[PDB]
Design a protein around this nucleic acid. Structure first.
Lengths: 193, 203, 99, 204
RNA sequence: UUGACCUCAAAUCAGGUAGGAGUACCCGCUGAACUUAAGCAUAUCAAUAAGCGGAGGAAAAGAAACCAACCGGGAUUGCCUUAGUAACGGCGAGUGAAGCGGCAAAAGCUCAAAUUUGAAAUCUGGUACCUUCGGUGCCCGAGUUGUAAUUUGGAGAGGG
RNA sequence: GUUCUUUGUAAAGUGCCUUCGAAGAGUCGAGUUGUUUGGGAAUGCAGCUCUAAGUGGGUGGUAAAUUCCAUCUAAAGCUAA
């Protein structure tokens, strides 16, 4: 059970792992049926891509707020900023994420740019039938890449205000820290009897 | 409106005509029979907004259901095992008693497809319920995709599965971290979260 | 709201330009109505205070509101949701029969 | 058999039991006089149906698609009115000019808001007995939820006559049965024999 | 006297449908033991065996009473990932995640809540005929305890 | 793709001001129980008791009280991959 220096290993195999198993022997296979759907989809879909219009939306957390992410649909605030309605914009080829909203104007911009380049490039035909075919471009998302909203510059001049930045955090943290107890003493000298 | 007068009404089941329905329908139940068929809605505000429509191919199943628990089958006071389980009359019933009724009228006439039941009278020996029946045979519902979906053999014995109100409820499957243990179909996520699946060039 | 720029503090982020949304009625979910208040008030007339209402109203006019606060506390469970039930009866007391 | 058993105890077991102020106001139904003229006067008010709907498409066949008649062609409907949600919302905005409250309705629950309505929205009503006799002169079934917001200038005379009769003999006796708890009427068994008990042990 | 009226039912029932099969895999319920702890009840085994209810090729999930704390994100599903960690457990043996990132694949919607009432106007069936998965002349009923028709939240409805 | 025919005082979308905007209860959560269970002073689920509301209400993973907010709309429904 335990003899000679080795790491204490937790290997969850006390049950019937030897019953509910699945080595992907269908890796290359289901991977090929994948590329097949692509071409079978096309024959049907006529000149419309394997995916529709997806946005540039920054990612959450203290770890992913660093760079943007391939967003979901498209809010109706960014929908009318383009010039059309959702019950008609989706029937075109643009996603509509109505449960979500936009709280920043800097990114709302990079996202309203994605709605202009895409719409000015959509040769749409009515219920005519003749429809002057103009082929199509493989993937819709791989055709309008990550325009990573302004990374700013990478070469400026020196600027020193002498705050240390290290104490601007030793105190920035002391700010949110004694907020409640420094208001405790500020509660006494708050009410004048 | 009118129906919303009864929407707020079918809320204060505590006095006058409401507390008076306690001393009237309690005996109405213990009178007709136990598991039976009715005619028109008893509470139009509920049924309707929950799925009732006054048109052909429409019937109702008012049913008497017993309360309490489900004492572990095992004869006398024998459980054949370790105490972790032992207990008998002190045993739950993971599915709601409400399902008990549906699953009965539901399989008395499986020619129909169970839409949903509604509560109306709790006592001591029982807890009563009623049912809104969608008929996958009369052209009255078989001419309206407003609720046409019901007739399809993919809806075979609705109630006895969990596609009703009490259903998604009595499945533990709802959106949110309140259900991370099973936000997926019970054994789907179970088999999944334990299954050891390996690659081609094992990483 | 606005941030400070500092990576921590009252706001550990970026002072990047905010913006305003549309009237999401999913922030308006708490709505009443001339059709509903008509009914909610017409309710206290078609049925009015029930057995539980008579019971607790006499609990305030007993030893106070703190006492009637632990009665509706033994009916709903939310000490705070109970404070709601308290002032609602004083609305049946003062507002209806008091003036 | 079992169908007379359950139905007889149904309303008669409801009489031993003390009926709430929401009920009891019943039995206090329409007097035999109102029924007489409310049948001879409402026999001139019958809504569109059968030959009436057919005679409508022939008159617009010589008007609408003839001398271009915009929505209007024949005289606006002047008879009796119907509708649960129709006559229900009618009183909620004074639109009603006559109220006839639903006597029966197995579920007296969807007609509970009819009475307290005319209350804080004053409108003359009379709980009339005949959800069937109502359906006969309205060519419907058993609804008893009738309305009359207008009439002709040859019959509106006897209208205001019974308008005050129903109002006083029903609407003004209502503000009275507000604190009234009816029911509790026993039968000959526990009654005449209940006399032999209290009459042979008290002041005899 | 005549006729309604709701419930009940009635019948080689006009006239319609239901059982069951298979049962790797899935959706419920169900339910341990052996085993492990070097003994052993809690645990573990395993919300698995067997048990019993029901489909369909997938059925279930499925548009938020979600995630988050960020510049936020954004249906479900499944996938590498998180991580055998934070954590549950004689905190003993062992049990056991999610949201993020990456990902294929991606999609949307419908009923009650209103007073249309200048209009029961709609839906089941029968029936001559017909271009017959139905249709119009003829005739009933459900339904007025809301079928039409307006109405679904990201909205959108009466007035003008 | 071509041919024989208007369902048309036809039907629906974004615009302006305005009056409005209902929004599902023996639920909700609370109580105690047992199972479940990473969910640990309830992870849901079920139990018998209790039975609301609308600047309200579910959530913000440590009980609880006050202060808003962040956050979303249950108690009704179809849906390929």
């Amino acid at each position: 059970a335990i003899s000679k220096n080795l790491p204490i290993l937790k290997n969850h195999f006390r049950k019937h792992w030897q019953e509910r198993v699945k080595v992907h022997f269908d890796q290359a296979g289901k991977k090929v049926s994948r590329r097949n759907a692509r071409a079978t989809r096309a024959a049907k879909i006529a000149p419309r891509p394997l995916d529709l219009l997806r946005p540039v939306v920054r990612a959450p957390t203290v770890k992913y707020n660093r760079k943007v992410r391939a967003g979901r649909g498209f809010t109706l605030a960014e929908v009318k900023a383009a010039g059309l309605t959702a019950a008609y914009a989706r029937t075109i080829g643009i996603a509509v994420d109505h449960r979500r909203q936009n709280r920043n104007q800097e990114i709302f911009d990079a996202n309203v740019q994605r709605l202009k380049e895409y719409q000015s490039k959509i040769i749409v035909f009515p219920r005519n039938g003749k429809a002057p075919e103009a082929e199509q471009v493989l993937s819709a998302a791989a055709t309008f890449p990550i325009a990573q909203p302004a990374t700013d510059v990478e070469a400026r001049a020196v600027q020193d205000n002498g705050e240390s930045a290290f104490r601007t955090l030793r105190l920035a943290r002391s700010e949110k820290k004694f907020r409640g107890i420094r208001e405790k003493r500020a509660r006494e000298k708050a009410e004048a009897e | 409106g009118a129906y919303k007068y009864l929407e707020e009404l079918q809320r204060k089941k505590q006095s006058d005509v409401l507390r008076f329905l306690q001393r009237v329908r309690v005996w109405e139940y213990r009178q007709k029979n136990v598991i039976h068929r009715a005619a028109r809605p008893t509470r139009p505000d509920k049924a309707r907004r929950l799925g009732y429509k006054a048109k052909q191919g429409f019937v109702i199943y008012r049913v008497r259901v017993r309360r309490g628990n489900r004492k572990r089958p095992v004869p006398k006071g024998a459980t054949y095992g370790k105490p972790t389980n032992q207990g008998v009359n002190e045993l739950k019933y993971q599915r709601s008693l409400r399902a008990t009724a549906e699953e009965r009228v539901g399989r008395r006439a499986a020619n129909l497809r169970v839409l949903n039941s509604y509560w109306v009278n709790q006592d001591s020996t029982y807890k009563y319920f009623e049912v809104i029946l969608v008929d996958p045979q009369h052209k009255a519902i078989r001419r309206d995709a407003r609720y046409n979906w019901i007739c399809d053999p993919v809806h075979k014995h609705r109630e006895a599965r969990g596609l009703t109100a009490t259903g998604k409820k009595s499945r533990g499957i709802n959106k949110g971290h309140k259900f991370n243990n099973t936000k997926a179909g019970r054994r789907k996520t179970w088999k999944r979260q334990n299954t050891l699946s390996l690659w081609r060039y094992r990483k | 709201t606005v941030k400070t720029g500092i990576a921590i503090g009252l706001n550990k982020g970026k002072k990047v330009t905010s913006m305003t949304p549309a009237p999401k009625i999913s922030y308006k979910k708490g709505a009443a109505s001339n059709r509903t208040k008509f009914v909610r008030s017409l309710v206290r007339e078609i049925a009015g205070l029930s057995p539980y209402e008579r019971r607790l109203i006499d609990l305030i006019r007993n030893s106070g509101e703190k006492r009637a606060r632990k009665v509706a506390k033994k009916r709903l469970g939310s000490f705070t949701r109970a404070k709601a039930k308290v002032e609602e009866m004083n609305n049946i007391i003062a507002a209806s029969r008091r003036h | 058999p079992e169908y007379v058993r359950v139905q007889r105890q149904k309303k008669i077991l409801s009489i031993r039991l003390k009926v709430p102020p929401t009920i009891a106001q019943f039995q206090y139904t329409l007097d035999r006089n109102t029924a007489a003229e409310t049948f001879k006067l409402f026999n001139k008010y019958r809504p569109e149906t059968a030959a009436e709907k057919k005679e409508r498409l022939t008159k617009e066949a010589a008007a609408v698609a003839e001398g271009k008649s915009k929505q209007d062609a024949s005289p606006k409907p002047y008879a009796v009115k119907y509708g649960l949600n129709h006559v229900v919302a009618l009183i909620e905005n004074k639109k009603a000019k006559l109220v006839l409250i639903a006597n029966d309705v197995d579920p007296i629950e969807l007609v509970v808001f009819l009475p307290a309505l005319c209350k804080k929205m004053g409108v003359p009503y009379a709980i009339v007995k005949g959800k069937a006799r109502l359906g006969t002169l309205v060519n419907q079934k058993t609804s008893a939820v009738a309305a009359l917001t207008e009439v002709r200038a040859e019959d509106e005379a006897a209208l205001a006559k019974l308008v005050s009769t129903i109002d006083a003999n029903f609407a003004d006796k209502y503000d009275e049965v507000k604190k009234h708890w009816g029911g509790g009427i026993l039968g000959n068994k526990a009654q005449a024999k209940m006399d032999k008990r209290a009459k042979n042990s008290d002041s005899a």
